[PDB]
Enzyme design. Sequence first.
Site: not given
Lengths: 377, 377, 377, 377, 377
Positions: B87, B90, B92, B96, B135, B157
Site C-alpha cells: 500500500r 502516503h 492524510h 488512522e 506511512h 480512500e
Amino acid sequence: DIPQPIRGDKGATVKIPRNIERDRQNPDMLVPPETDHGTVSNMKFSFSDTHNRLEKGGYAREVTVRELPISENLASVNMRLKPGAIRELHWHKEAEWAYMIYGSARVTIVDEKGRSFIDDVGEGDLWYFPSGLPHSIQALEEGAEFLLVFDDGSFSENSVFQLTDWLAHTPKEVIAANFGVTKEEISNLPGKEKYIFENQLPGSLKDDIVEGPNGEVPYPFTYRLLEQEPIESEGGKVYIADSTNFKVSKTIASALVTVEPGAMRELHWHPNTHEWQYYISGKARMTVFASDGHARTFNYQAGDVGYVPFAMGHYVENIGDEPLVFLEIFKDDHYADVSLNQWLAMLPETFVQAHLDLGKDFTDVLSKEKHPVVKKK
Amino acid sequence: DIPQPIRGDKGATVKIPRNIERDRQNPDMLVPPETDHGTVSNMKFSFSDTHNRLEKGGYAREVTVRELPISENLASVNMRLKPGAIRELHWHKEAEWAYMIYGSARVTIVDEKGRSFIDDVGEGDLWYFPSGLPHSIQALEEGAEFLLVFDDGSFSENSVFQLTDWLAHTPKEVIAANFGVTKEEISNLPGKEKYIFENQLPGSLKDDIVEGPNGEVPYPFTYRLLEQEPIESEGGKVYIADSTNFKVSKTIASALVTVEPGAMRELHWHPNTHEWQYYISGKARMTVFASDGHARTFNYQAGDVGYVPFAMGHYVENIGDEPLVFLEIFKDDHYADVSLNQWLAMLPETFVQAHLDLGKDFTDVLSKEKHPVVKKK
Amino acid sequence: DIPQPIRGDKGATVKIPRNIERDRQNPDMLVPPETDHGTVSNMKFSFSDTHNRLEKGGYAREVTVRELPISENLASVNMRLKPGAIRELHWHKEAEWAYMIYGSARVTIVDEKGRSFIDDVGEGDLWYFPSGLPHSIQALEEGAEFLLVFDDGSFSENSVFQLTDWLAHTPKEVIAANFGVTKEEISNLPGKEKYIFENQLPGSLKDDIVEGPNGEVPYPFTYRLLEQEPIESEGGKVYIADSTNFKVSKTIASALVTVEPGAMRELHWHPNTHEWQYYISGKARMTVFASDGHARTFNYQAGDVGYVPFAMGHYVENIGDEPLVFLEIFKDDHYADVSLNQWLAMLPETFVQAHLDLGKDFTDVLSKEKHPVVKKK
Amino acid sequence: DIPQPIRGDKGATVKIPRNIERDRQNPDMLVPPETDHGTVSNMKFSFSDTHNRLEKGGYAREVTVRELPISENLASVNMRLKPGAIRELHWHKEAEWAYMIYGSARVTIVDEKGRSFIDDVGEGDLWYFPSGLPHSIQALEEGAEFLLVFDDGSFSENSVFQLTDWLAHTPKEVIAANFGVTKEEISNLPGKEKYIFENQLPGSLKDDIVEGPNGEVPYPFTYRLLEQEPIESEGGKVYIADSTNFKVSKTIASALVTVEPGAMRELHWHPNTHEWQYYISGKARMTVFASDGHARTFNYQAGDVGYVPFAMGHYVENIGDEPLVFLEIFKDDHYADVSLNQWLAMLPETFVQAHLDLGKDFTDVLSKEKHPVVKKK
Amino acid sequence: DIPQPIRGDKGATVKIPRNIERDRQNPDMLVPPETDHGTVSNMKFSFSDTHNRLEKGGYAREVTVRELPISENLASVNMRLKPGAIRELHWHKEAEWAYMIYGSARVTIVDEKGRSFIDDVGEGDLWYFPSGLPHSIQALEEGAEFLLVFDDGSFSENSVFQLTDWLAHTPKEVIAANFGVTKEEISNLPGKEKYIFENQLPGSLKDDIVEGPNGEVPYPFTYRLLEQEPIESEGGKVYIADSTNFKVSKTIASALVTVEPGAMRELHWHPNTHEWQYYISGKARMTVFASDGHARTFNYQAGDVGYVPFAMGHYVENIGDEPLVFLEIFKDDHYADVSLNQWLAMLPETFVQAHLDLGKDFTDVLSKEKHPVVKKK
Ligand SMILES: [Mn+2]
Ligand SMILES: [Mn+2]
Ligand SMILES: [Mn+2]
Ligand SMILES: [Mn+2]
Ligand SMILES: [Mn+2]
Ligand SMILES: [Mn+2]
Ligand SMILES: [Mn+2]
Ligand SMILES: [Mn+2]
Ligand SMILES: [Mn+2]
Ligand SMILES: [Mn+2]
C-alpha cells in the site's frame, strides 16, 4: 459457487468472514467495471435493510435521507394494508406521490376549498396529494401494497399529522366548543392515534361519494398510468406521468420503465433535476457518471431504492432473466431527458467523428428518433 | 422457509417482489421487538454493499458518512494486500487506527521529528498513525487483510496523499532542485500514483530497521491487543486499547469483544462519545435506545458496520450458533461505559425498588462488579 | 511617481516592501474617499490573478466563489480558442451565458426534445444554454475569445461533463449494446477526455445544419446584442438582454454598458438581485453602499470581475482616458434598476427638499426621464 | 401611573393597545439610555413566559436556544420537587450544573468506574454531574426548588434518558437475560417513564450510603458555595465556583453575585467565553456593548434569564429597593474577568489621560485592587 | 389572588422569587392543558419586551428572528409617527406589508419603471411595497401607529437603506457629477441619516400627486381591508387580503380576524406555509399541535407576536371579556386553510365514525360550509 473480487490480475480473494449472499447480489460491486473510477456517494439502498413498523392491519417501512444521504429532496415509504384496513386520516407538509403495486384501495382527499375527492385505485395506478391536504387510504377485498414518495428526504412516517392524535392533544373544552357539543358527547374519542387499523370492507364507491356546497374538484387526484399508451421501443416501454398529463402532480414527475431481458434503458441524463429510483422487479446494473472521470456502478433488484444526482450520466441494464421493472421519480413539474444517441445523431457527422476518433461506420448507426429502451440484437 | 413481517396480530405478508435473502439476515427488522418505537437514523451498513476498488496486489472498499450519514466523525476501510504487495507510501489529514484480521504486514512511519518506526503486525494486532504522519503497509508471505478506521467520516480512500502522485504533480525543476540532482537523474519517476502494487516479499524486519540522528521514537505505533489479559466474564471477553495503554492512540479508543453463543454484551451506554462498530464474525442484534421512548433494533453479521450515538442505551446479543466477535470504536482518549446492572447495584435497594416497581427478589441479583458480557444460565 | 496612502492629514507613507504597480491600479483603495466607511466584503477580482488552464487549441481560466466568496450565485470563465479549435461537446448542471469579445465561433446545442440548434456567433453576440443541455463551441478563422457566466458560484471549469470522458468511463459492453455495434467497432474511442482540441476549420454554417423528426427549436440560443438599438444618453449607452427580449435567457439578465471619458453610470440600485460585473476595457471606480453607513470604493480595469450585493447603492465612474466598457449580469428573468435621480424627480419638490436640506435650485435639475449614463458637462 | 416611550423630545405616546405591565417591568427598554445604539440579539427571557411541565410531585420548565437563540451553548431548567418526590434516575449527553434556591434534596450519581456518590444538598449549594453520568434528585421534608444549567442550548427536559423508559423499550427477553432472571420476575416493570413521582421521604443520609468494590469517588459532586468566604466589596459580594475550587465542575464556571441597593456589578467583560445569567431576586438593568458602537440595555428581575456574548462590555446595576441577587454562568474551566477600573488603574496616568480627554482628577480615583461590586457613595 | 402551577394532583406551589404579573398573563402556561405534551419551539413574543428606538417624531421597535428564532421567514416592526413626522425615504431587500392600527399617513413609492404612487392610508388599511422599491411614510394630523411585516426574519430596522445615509457616504464629486451641479450647490446635504424626523403637516393629497413620462402604476400599493365584506360567522369575522385581491401583494398573504367573547377561530391548519401572528387587542390562547403527539398552548394579548409552523394544527380561543382582534400573516401568494369541521363533514359518515369511535349524533353536527369563527352557544 463463491465469487471473488478479482478482475484479470487486479484484486484478490476475500480472506476474512464475509457476506456471500450480498456479494452475490452485487456482482458489479464486488467486481466493478474496469472503467469505474473515483468516489461517488452511495446510490443504492434496500427496504429489506430497514426497520418495519407493524400495526393491526398492515405495515410501513421507509427509506429516507437518514438511510440514503444523497437523496435530500425525496423520501419513500413501502406500505401494506390488509383487506379493509385503514391508513388513518392524516396530513403532512410534504406532497405525496404513489404507485399501486398490489391490490387496490379507496382514497379520500379534501382540497383547500372544502371539496372532497374519493376514488378507487388499482394496480398500476398513481395518486398524488398536494402538500398539506388531508387524506386517507383504505384497502379493498384484496388488501393493498404500494410505494409512497414524499418531496422531502427528511420525511418520517412516524412524524405525520394524524386526525385522532390531534384531537387527543386538544383541550376537551376546545374540541367541544369547536363543534358545539358537550364534553360528554365526545368523552369516547380515542385517547391515542390509530395510524393503521383493521376495519370492515367499505361499500361501493358510489355510496361513498360526498357532494357539497362547493362542487367537484377541478382535477382528479388519481391517474391510470398503465392505461396510457407507453413510449414503446424494441427492448421495452416507458409510461410517463408528470404535471403535463397527470395535472395535479405538480412537484413530482414519474416514469414506469419495463425492460425485457437482454435490453437496457439507454444512455442518457436529466437536465432538470435528480432521479430517484425504485426497483419493483428484476435485476439491474447502473453506472453513474459524475464527471471529472468519476464513475461508479451499482446493482439493484426488487425492493431496492436507487438514485442519480442532477445531470449525471447513466443507463439501466437488465442483467437478469426476467423483465426488469422500475420507477423513475423527479421533483419537478415535467419529465425530461437527453439521449446520448439522439444527441449525436443531431450533430454533423464529421463533427461527431472528430470527437470520437471513429468514422462513418459509427455515425451511420446513430438515430434521430428517441428510443429510451433498446435490445441487444 | 419464508419469513413474514407478522407479530401476533400486527403486520401482514409481503405481497410485492422482495429480497428474501436480506429479509432472512434481518429478522429483528422484518419483525422488530414489540418494544421498538419511533424513528432513529440508520445504524447499520454492509461492506458487501459497497464498490470495491481493485488494484494489482489487493483491494480497498470503504464505509463513510456517504454511506452511513449518522457516522460524521468516523469512517472505515476494509483493505486487502496480496503477499508482498505494498500500500503505497502516503499520508492524510485523518488519524488512522487499524486491526489486523488476517495475516501480517510490515508498516513504516516517520514522526514530526524525522524519526522512523518499522514493525511487523500479526493477527489481533493494532496500529495507530497520528494525523498527518507518512506511512505504508506491506503484507508478508501470507498476504494480509485488515480494517482501517479514520477519525473523520468524510474520509475517502481515493483522496489520500500518495508519494508518487505528489512527485508527478511537482515541477521537475523543483524536484531536481529539492534533492540536488539533475532532471535526467529522475526522468524515470512514475508519471502516475501506484496506490497498491505487487512487489517481492520483504526481508527480515531487522534488516529493514533504519537508525538516524534523532533516535528511537518515544512510543511504538503498534500494539498487541490479543496478548493482553482480557476483562473476562462468563459470556465472553473484552480487550480494550486506548490512550491509557496504547499510548500513541490519542484520538481513537477501542475494544475487541467476543461473545459466546447464548451470551450478550450487557446493557450499557457510553458517557463520552459515539460508538462505531465493526462485525468480524457471528450474528447479532442490538437495540439502540434514543430517549423520548424512541428505540430501534438492528441485525448485524460479518462485514457489517454498526453505530451508537453518544450515550444511547444498547446491548449486543449473540443470536447465532458461533462466537460473536466485534470491535467497539470511539473518537476519544479513553474507553468508558456505564453498566445498567452495576449502576443500580450501587444505589439504595429501596430507592431502586421504588423506581422499578419490583422488590427485594430483583435487587438481590444486582452486582457491583462489572461484567461486560453475561451468559444465559 | 510613487503614490502614498495619505489623505489630508490622515494616513502615512508605506514603510515596508510593497506592490507599487497594484497600488497604482487601485488609487481609490490606497486612498479611499473620505466618505468610505466600515467593512464590506471584497467586490473585485482579476482574471490575471488566476491559474490558467492551457490546452492544445486554447485556454480557460475562471473566477468562482473560491476566489470571490461574495458571489455565491454566479461564476465565470474567460476562454480562448485558436482557429478551428473545439471546446469539446459537453454539458453541466449550471445554465450558461456568454459574450463574444473577440472573433467568432460556431455553437451547437440539443434541447430536451431532441432538437439541435447550430449558429455562428460574432463579436458583440451572446448565447445562452439552459441548464443541462449539451453544447459545444468551435472557433472560426479568426479564433475566438469570450466570457462565460454560470448561474452557480460553485462552478468549476474542471468539473464539467465531457462527451468522451463519459464514454471512457462506461463499460465497453454497455456502450456497444447502447448503439447496437460490436466492441471492436468502438475499440478506438478516446481513452481520455479532450476538453479543448485542435481541428480543421469548419465548413459553411449551412452545410452543418441538421434537420430532424422533431423540427426547429422554438427560440434561438444566440442573440445579437450590439445589433439592438441601445438606450442612449449623453455619457454613453446601455444594451440590455434579458428573458423579455432574449427569450431563452431565463436565469440570466444582462446589460453591456459603454461609458465615455468624463461620463459615469449613474447612481442606482437593483431591486431584484445581485449584480455581477465584468470589465472589458477602461478604468473605473465604484462605491458600494451597504447601509448602516457602510461604504467602500473599488477600482476596476480590463480583466477585472466586480460585484454588487442585492440592492446596494452604486455608480460606475470612468476615471480613464479611453471609453469604459463593462457587463452587468443578474441571476433573474429581467433587468431592473432604480435611478436615484428619476426617483427624487418623481416625488413632491418640497418633500425632497425637506429630506436633503437643499432648495428649489436642486430639485429643478432633477429629471423624470431615466438617463443611465451621464456626462460631466 | 402610565409610562410612555418619550425621552426629552424623542419618542411619543403609545396609541395602540399595549402591555402596560411589561412596559413597567422594562423601563430601560420602553425608554432606553440615550447612549444605546444599533441592533443586538435578544439578551433576556423570562421563565414565566414558558410552558410549565406539571407532574405528580413537581414541575419543570425550561429556557433553551428555542426561546433565547443567542444562547447556543447553554440551557436551563427551573425544577420543583414536592417533599419526598423523586426526579427519576436518568442521564443525558449534556453536563449539568445546579444551584439550590429553596429547600434541600438528596442526589445520587455513579461515575464511569462504577462508584456511587450520595449527598444532601441545601440552599446555596451546587452540584455538577459530568456528561453522561446517571443521577437522580430526591427532595427532603421541605421539598425543593432549584435551577439546572446544561452545557448545550439545544437541550430539552423532555428528551432526557430515563431509567424506566429505557427498560420499557428493551425486549423483555433481553432484560431478563441481562440480569439472569425470568421474564415473570420482571413482569411488573413500569410500562412507561415516570419522570417525576411522589414517594415517601428518604431515611438518613448515612443509611443510604453504598460502598463498593471500587471505593470512594476521587472528588465530591456537590459544593457549598455559600460556605465560602466571598470576594467582598462595598456594594456586595461574589461567590465563585469553578474547576479550580469545585473540582469536578470542568465545563461550567459560576459566580453568585449579591448587590445592595444603590450598588452595581462594575464595568467589565469576560475574555474567555459567553455569560449566561439567571436572576434570583431583585431588579436590574444591564447594557451590553457589542462594539462598532452597538449597545443595548435590558431590564431583569426574578425568574429572568440573561446573557452576554463573549467579551461584550457590561455592568449590572441594581435599580430596585431590595438586594439584587443573580448567577453568572460560563462554559469554561475557570471564571475570569477584566475590570475596566483595574485595567486603567494599571496603565500610565498620562497615557490614560490622553485616551479619555480627562485629567489627573480622574486617574486619581482609579484603583488597582479589583472591586467587582461598588456602592453609590 | 396568586396563581400556582397546580392541576389536580400534578404540579406544586412556586417557592422561589417569581414574576406573578406574567404568571397572570400566561394562565395556560403556568397551568397548561392536560392534553399538552412534549417540546415545541417558542411561539410567542411581546413587543413590550424589546428595545424601543426613540427618534424626533416617533419610535420603532422590532420582533425579529433574533427574538423569535422559529420565525426565520418573517419579521416585524411596530412603528409610531407624530403628526407630520416623516419616516425617511428609504428602501430595503425585504418586501414590506403594513396594517394601519391608529391614525393615518401618506406613503410614496416609485416602481422599477420610474412611476411614483402616492396615497393616504387610514385605520384598517394596508400597504405593500415590493422588494427593493423606495418608499416613505408621513403621518397626518392625528399622527400614526402601525405594524410592518418583512419577508425575511433576519431583517433589522437599523440596517435599512436611507436616502441621506447613501448620499453622505458617496463622494461629493460623484454626487455633483451625477446631477450636473457643483460641489457647492450640495454643500448643505445632511452629513448623517435622519431615519425619522419632525416636519410640518403635508398639504392635500391631490397637490402632491406627481405625473411623469411613464404614466400611472398598473396597480395600487394600498388596500382598504376593512372596506371589504368580511367572511362573517356567528363568533366573528375574517378579512382576507392576498395576491388574488390585493394585487401587488405577491409575497404576503393576510387576514384580520375579530373574535367575539365566547367565540373562537376554529380548528384548522394551513397547507401552504407558516403563520405569523400579531395581536392587536384582547386575550387569547392557542394550542399548536406539532404531530408525534407534541402539543403546546400559548397565551397572547395586545402587543404579542405569535406563530404556527407550516401545517401545525391550531385554534384561537378568546378567553377575555372584550373582542379579540389579531392578524394572520403568510409568506405566500394566497391565503388557504383546512377546516377540521368542513374536512370531516365532507367524508362518509361511517368512515368518520370509524375513526373517532363516536356515532351519528356527532357526524350530524358536522357542517360542509366553512365557518372560520364559531360561538359557544
Ligand atoms: Mn400520507
Ligand atoms: Mn434516468
Ligand atoms: Mn493510511
Ligand atoms: Mn457499547
Ligand atoms: Mn459549457
Ligand atoms: Mn448596477
Ligand atoms: Mn439531569
Ligand atoms: Mn459579567
Ligand atoms: Mn420600509
Ligand atoms: Mn391559522
